[PDB]
Amino acid sequence: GIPATNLSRVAGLEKQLAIELKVKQGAENMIQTYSNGSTKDRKLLLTAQQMLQDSKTKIDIIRMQLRRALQADQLENQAAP
Numbered sequence: 113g114i115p116a117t118n119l120s121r122v123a124g125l126e127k128q129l130a131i132e133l134k135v136k137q138g139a140e141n142m143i144q145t146y147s148n149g150s151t152k153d154r155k156l157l158l159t160a161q162q163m164l165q166d167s168k169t170k171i172d173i174i175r176m177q178l179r180r181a182l183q184a185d186q187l188e189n190q191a192a193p
Contacts, residue, residue, distance in 0.1 A: 113181075114185075115185070116124070121181060125177065125178050125181065127171065128174050129174060130187075132167060132170065132171045132174065135163065135167045135173065136164060136167045136168060138165040138166060139160045139161075139163040140164060142156070142160045143160045143161065143164070146160070174193075
């Protein structure tokens with residue numbers, strides 16, 4: 113998964129982030145819309161709330177993985193004993 117033509121590792125991590133935005137942003141859009149007046153569904157309201165909580169949690173997890181990816185690839189001098 114070298115950061116070059118391969119784009120194997122980059123594509124995997126990048127796509128994951130994209131999916132998160134779709135679900136997270138999607139949930140937020142629904143929550144705000146409900147407050148407006150149109151839908152204002154109570155059952156749906158809570159449902160979206162749960163969606164956002166789970167979605168955001170996974171995002172932070174993936175972010176950590178990214179940083180870890182760069183650390184491993186970099187190595188920096190001799191590997192620590």
